[PDB]
PDB file of C-alpha atoms in Angstrom:
ATOM      1  CA  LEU N   7      56.925  42.321  25.113  1.00 52.13           C
ATOM      2  CA  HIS N   8      55.886  45.561  23.237  1.00 53.23           C
ATOM      3  CA  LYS N   9      52.048  46.737  22.422  1.00 51.89           C
ATOM      4  CA  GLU N  10      51.239  46.903  18.716  1.00 54.62           C
ATOM      5  CA  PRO N  11      48.295  48.904  17.385  1.00 58.55           C
ATOM      6  CA  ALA N  12      44.776  47.138  16.181  1.00 62.12           C
ATOM      7  CA  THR N  13      41.264  48.761  15.471  1.00 62.35           C
ATOM      8  CA  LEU N  14      38.031  47.053  16.882  1.00 62.86           C
ATOM      9  CA  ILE N  15      36.003  45.303  14.260  1.00 64.17           C
ATOM     10  CA  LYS N  16      33.671  43.334  16.609  1.00 60.94           C
ATOM     11  CA  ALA N  17      33.504  42.135  20.419  1.00 59.87           C
ATOM     12  CA  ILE N  18      32.300  38.541  20.286  1.00 58.10           C
ATOM     13  CA  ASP N  19      32.068  37.244  23.857  1.00 56.83           C
ATOM     14  CA  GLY N  20      33.973  38.113  27.175  1.00 55.37           C
ATOM     15  CA  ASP N  21      37.289  36.339  26.271  1.00 53.76           C
ATOM     16  CA  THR N  22      37.164  36.886  22.249  1.00 54.96           C
ATOM     17  CA  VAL N  23      37.343  40.202  20.232  1.00 56.63           C
ATOM     18  CA  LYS N  24      37.873  40.497  16.535  1.00 57.57           C
ATOM     19  CA  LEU N  25      40.370  42.970  15.578  1.00 56.88           C
ATOM     20  CA  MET N  26      42.119  44.635  12.570  1.00 58.18           C
ATOM     21  CA  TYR N  27      45.834  43.826  13.001  1.00 53.67           C
ATOM     22  CA  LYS N  28      48.262  44.475  10.365  1.00 56.69           C
ATOM     23  CA  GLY N  29      45.509  44.902   7.840  1.00 61.12           C
ATOM     24  CA  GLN N  30      43.955  41.629   8.279  1.00 64.18           C
ATOM     25  CA  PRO N  31      40.847  40.505  10.014  1.00 65.30           C
ATOM     26  CA  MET N  32      41.597  38.256  13.341  1.00 67.08           C
ATOM     27  CA  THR N  33      40.248  36.879  16.048  1.00 68.72           C
ATOM     28  CA  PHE N  34      41.823  37.244  19.537  1.00 69.64           C
ATOM     29  CA  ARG N  35      41.187  34.961  22.777  1.00 69.70           C
ATOM     30  CA  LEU N  36      42.115  36.886  25.912  1.00 72.98           C
ATOM     31  CA  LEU N  37      45.307  35.409  27.395  1.00 73.85           C
ATOM     32  CA  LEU N  38      45.335  33.971  30.972  1.00 75.69           C
ATOM     33  CA  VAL N  39      41.617  34.504  31.782  1.00 77.36           C
ATOM     34  CA  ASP N  40      38.735  32.198  31.586  1.00 77.44           C
ATOM     35  CA  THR N  41      35.431  34.189  31.305  1.00 77.33           C
ATOM     36  CA  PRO N  42      31.671  32.860  31.649  1.00 80.37           C
ATOM     37  CA  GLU N  43      31.035  32.574  28.379  1.00 82.33           C
ATOM     38  CA  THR N  44      27.644  33.233  26.119  1.00 77.92           C
ATOM     39  CA  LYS N  45      29.146  30.659  23.489  1.00 79.70           C
ATOM     40  CA  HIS N  46      29.967  26.810  23.477  1.00 75.91           C
ATOM     41  CA  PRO N  47      27.216  24.208  24.468  1.00 76.57           C
ATOM     42  CA  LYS N  48      28.689  22.806  27.401  1.00 75.49           C
ATOM     43  CA  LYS N  49      27.316  25.874  29.301  1.00 76.02           C
ATOM     44  CA  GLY N  50      25.755  27.636  26.447  1.00 76.77           C
ATOM     45  CA  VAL N  51      25.095  31.301  28.112  1.00 77.35           C
ATOM     46  CA  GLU N  52      26.568  30.936  31.758  1.00 74.80           C
ATOM     47  CA  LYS N  53      25.900  33.009  35.118  1.00 77.44           C
ATOM     48  CA  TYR N  54      27.612  36.297  34.337  1.00 75.66           C
ATOM     49  CA  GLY N  55      28.416  35.526  30.926  1.00 78.73           C
ATOM     50  CA  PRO N  56      26.147  38.296  29.713  1.00 82.44           C
ATOM     51  CA  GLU N  57      27.663  40.707  32.315  1.00 84.21           C
ATOM     52  CA  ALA N  58      31.404  39.762  31.164  1.00 80.81           C
ATOM     53  CA  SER N  59      30.471  40.148  27.752  1.00 82.08           C
ATOM     54  CA  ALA N  60      28.822  43.609  27.861  1.00 77.73           C
ATOM     55  CA  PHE N  61      32.021  44.705  30.015  1.00 79.03           C
ATOM     56  CA  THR N  62      34.588  43.592  27.243  1.00 75.57           C
ATOM     57  CA  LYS N  63      32.134  45.169  24.596  1.00 73.72           C
ATOM     58  CA  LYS N  64      31.788  48.568  26.459  1.00 72.76           C
ATOM     59  CA  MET N  65      35.695  48.781  27.075  1.00 71.82           C
ATOM     60  CA  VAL N  66      37.083  47.950  23.626  1.00 73.18           C
ATOM     61  CA  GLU N  67      34.182  49.825  21.959  1.00 72.96           C
ATOM     62  CA  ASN N  68      34.504  53.012  23.975  1.00 70.62           C
ATOM     63  CA  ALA N  69      38.651  53.150  23.593  1.00 74.14           C
ATOM     64  CA  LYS N  70      40.277  55.742  21.752  1.00 72.44           C
ATOM     65  CA  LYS N  71      43.196  53.199  21.080  1.00 69.78           C
ATOM     66  CA  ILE N  72      43.436  49.535  21.244  1.00 70.08           C
ATOM     67  CA  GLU N  73      46.821  47.940  21.623  1.00 68.03           C
ATOM     68  CA  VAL N  74      47.207  44.033  21.313  1.00 68.60           C
ATOM     69  CA  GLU N  75      50.487  42.616  23.229  1.00 69.67           C
ATOM     70  CA  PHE N  76      51.664  38.964  22.352  1.00 70.26           C
ATOM     71  CA  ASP N  77      53.399  37.042  24.992  1.00 72.16           C
ATOM     72  CA  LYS N  78      56.732  35.229  24.488  1.00 69.22           C
ATOM     73  CA  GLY N  79      55.395  31.789  23.594  1.00 65.93           C
ATOM     74  CA  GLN N  80      53.031  30.609  20.425  1.00 66.64           C
ATOM     75  CA  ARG N  81      50.987  33.526  19.275  1.00 68.47           C
ATOM     76  CA  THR N  82      47.917  31.514  17.792  1.00 66.19           C
ATOM     77  CA  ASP N  83      46.026  28.594  19.509  1.00 68.69           C
ATOM     78  CA  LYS N  84      44.689  25.722  17.624  1.00 67.74           C
ATOM     79  CA  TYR N  85      41.530  27.494  16.484  1.00 67.03           C
ATOM     80  CA  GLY N  86      43.690  30.079  14.566  1.00 66.63           C
ATOM     81  CA  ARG N  87      42.771  32.935  17.148  1.00 67.52           C
ATOM     82  CA  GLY N  88      45.765  35.170  18.022  1.00 69.57           C
ATOM     83  CA  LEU N  89      46.698  34.667  22.165  1.00 69.96           C
ATOM     84  CA  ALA N  90      47.366  38.213  23.709  1.00 68.40           C
ATOM     85  CA  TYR N  91      46.962  40.930  26.441  1.00 68.59           C
ATOM     86  CA  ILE N  92      44.421  43.497  24.905  1.00 73.62           C
ATOM     87  CA  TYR N  93      44.844  47.158  26.045  1.00 75.16           C
ATOM     88  CA  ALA N  94      41.828  49.730  26.022  1.00 77.11           C
ATOM     89  CA  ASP N  95      43.502  53.268  26.089  1.00 79.24           C
ATOM     90  CA  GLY N  96      46.379  51.994  28.261  1.00 77.90           C
ATOM     91  CA  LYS N  97      44.582  49.493  30.516  1.00 75.56           C
ATOM     92  CA  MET N  98      44.497  45.888  30.229  1.00 74.44           C
ATOM     93  CA  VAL N  99      41.098  44.375  29.402  1.00 73.79           C
ATOM     94  CA  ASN N 100      42.118  41.100  30.816  1.00 72.29           C
ATOM     95  CA  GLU N 101      43.230  42.414  33.956  1.00 71.79           C
ATOM     96  CA  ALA N 102      40.137  44.672  34.401  1.00 75.52           C
ATOM     97  CA  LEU N 103      37.738  41.573  33.889  1.00 75.67           C
ATOM     98  CA  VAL N 104      39.654  39.771  36.569  1.00 74.71           C
ATOM     99  CA  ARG N 105      39.657  42.597  38.933  1.00 75.07           C
ATOM    100  CA  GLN N 106      36.012  42.840  38.518  1.00 77.28           C
ATOM    101  CA  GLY N 107      35.299  39.443  39.433  1.00 76.66           C
ATOM    102  CA  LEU N 108      33.933  38.719  36.236  1.00 76.75           C
ATOM    103  CA  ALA N 109      36.899  36.296  34.988  1.00 76.81           C
ATOM    104  CA  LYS N 110      39.186  33.764  37.097  1.00 78.84           C
ATOM    105  CA  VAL N 111      42.878  33.611  35.938  1.00 78.46           C
ATOM    106  CA  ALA N 112      42.928  30.303  33.789  1.00 79.41           C
ATOM    107  CA  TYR N 113      45.239  27.202  33.667  1.00 81.00           C
ATOM    108  CA  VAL N 114      48.719  28.777  32.734  1.00 78.16           C
ATOM    109  CA  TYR N 115      50.654  27.263  30.018  1.00 79.20           C
ATOM    110  CA  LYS N 116      54.436  28.129  30.217  1.00 80.14           C
ATOM    111  CA  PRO N 117      56.050  30.343  28.476  1.00 78.84           C
ATOM    112  CA  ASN N 118      52.800  32.450  27.940  1.00 78.85           C
ATOM    113  CA  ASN N 119      52.691  33.865  31.452  1.00 80.82           C
ATOM    114  CA  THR N 120      54.168  37.002  31.807  1.00 81.03           C
ATOM    115  CA  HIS N 121      51.634  38.827  33.376  1.00 78.39           C
ATOM    116  CA  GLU N 122      50.454  35.706  35.636  1.00 78.42           C
ATOM    117  CA  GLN N 123      51.355  37.391  39.016  1.00 83.03           C
ATOM    118  CA  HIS N 124      49.515  40.425  37.976  1.00 83.50           C
ATOM    119  CA  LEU N 125      46.638  38.890  37.613  1.00 83.32           C
ATOM    120  CA  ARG N 126      46.607  36.704  40.466  1.00 84.26           C
ATOM    121  CA  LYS N 127      47.114  39.490  42.553  1.00 84.15           C
ATOM    122  CA  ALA N 128      43.978  41.128  40.917  1.00 86.56           C
ATOM    123  CA  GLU N 129      42.000  37.909  41.398  1.00 89.32           C
ATOM    124  CA  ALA N 130      42.662  37.925  45.321  1.00 89.07           C
ATOM    125  CA  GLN N 131      41.372  41.701  45.501  1.00 94.98           C
ATOM    126  CA  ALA N 132      38.261  40.562  43.635  1.00 94.99           C
ATOM    127  CA  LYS N 133      37.641  37.522  45.788  1.00 93.48           C
ATOM    128  CA  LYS N 134      38.395  39.562  48.968  1.00 93.81           C
ATOM    129  CA  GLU N 135      35.844  41.991  47.725  1.00 94.23           C
ATOM    130  CA  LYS N 136      33.347  39.370  46.985  1.00 97.21           C
ATOM    131  CA  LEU N 137      32.644  40.749  43.731  1.00 96.38           C
ATOM    132  CA  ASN N 138      30.169  39.237  40.890  1.00 97.64           C
ATOM    133  CA  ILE N 139      31.713  35.483  40.513  1.00 99.76           C
ATOM    134  CA  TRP N 140      33.137  35.431  43.917  1.00101.05           C
ATOM    135  CA  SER N 141      29.882  36.992  45.520  1.00 98.31           C
TER     136      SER N 141
END
């Protein structure tokens, strides 16, 4: 896998950011993580949703460089969203959220699981430290 550059357009929720990618606006869903959301009606705004949302937003808005990294599998979901690992100045946002107890590793669909291990190790640590979602 390789990282490609992108530009922030708007952060939309903990798990979704709109980016300019190869000159087109595109919504990206963050691969392998489930965050409490401020959207959807089966929850609406959930517990730690505003927090997970603020974290994603601050982390991409304050970055110098955003890069996206597609996995080996399909690169869009059924809603037209890009499926990817997103990096703010070198740090993977999906991992940051999980390490902070602000997301859980989602159900995994092979073969889009290259960083699964990496993320699961972060989640175990956030559980052990009892942060946020695990507190």
